[PDB]
């Protein structure tokens, strides 16, 4: 699908769950987030901070679209742009993209 996420600050092509967790803990704000490519094929994770905890959400890359749960988008950038304006977890929007912080 679309590759426009490759230059986004929040996107990390090579970042483990553990590395992602240690990055997010340095940022005491709900809505801190990043996206990382998973070892599983055609899969990403959104790692985010909410209620003082780190959570991870799977995103499946399937054909010309990406899927999070039952929500479907044209691309990963469209998905992130959506959840920057609409809450992903309770009332938390994706708010603070983490670029190595």
């Amino acid at each position: 699908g679309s590759h426009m996420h490759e230059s986004k600050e929040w996107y990390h092509a090579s970042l483990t769950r553990a590395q992602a967790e240690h990055m997010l803990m340095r940022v005491p704000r709900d809505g801190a987030f990043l996206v990382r490519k998973r070892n599983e094929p055609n899969s990403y994770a959104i790692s985010f901070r909410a209620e003082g905890k780190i959570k991870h959400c799977r995103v499946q890359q399937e054909g010309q679209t990406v899927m999070l749960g039952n929500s479907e988008f044209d691309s990963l950038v469209d998905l992130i742009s959506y959840y920057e304006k609409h809450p992903l977890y309770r009332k938390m929007k994706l708010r603070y993209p983490i670029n190595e912080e």
């Binding site: 994770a45 959570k55 991870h56 959400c57």
Partner: peptide, 6 residues
């Protein structure tokens, strides 16, 4: 949840 669902 290992992965939060949604």
């Amino acid at each position: 949840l290992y992965y939060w669902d949604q």
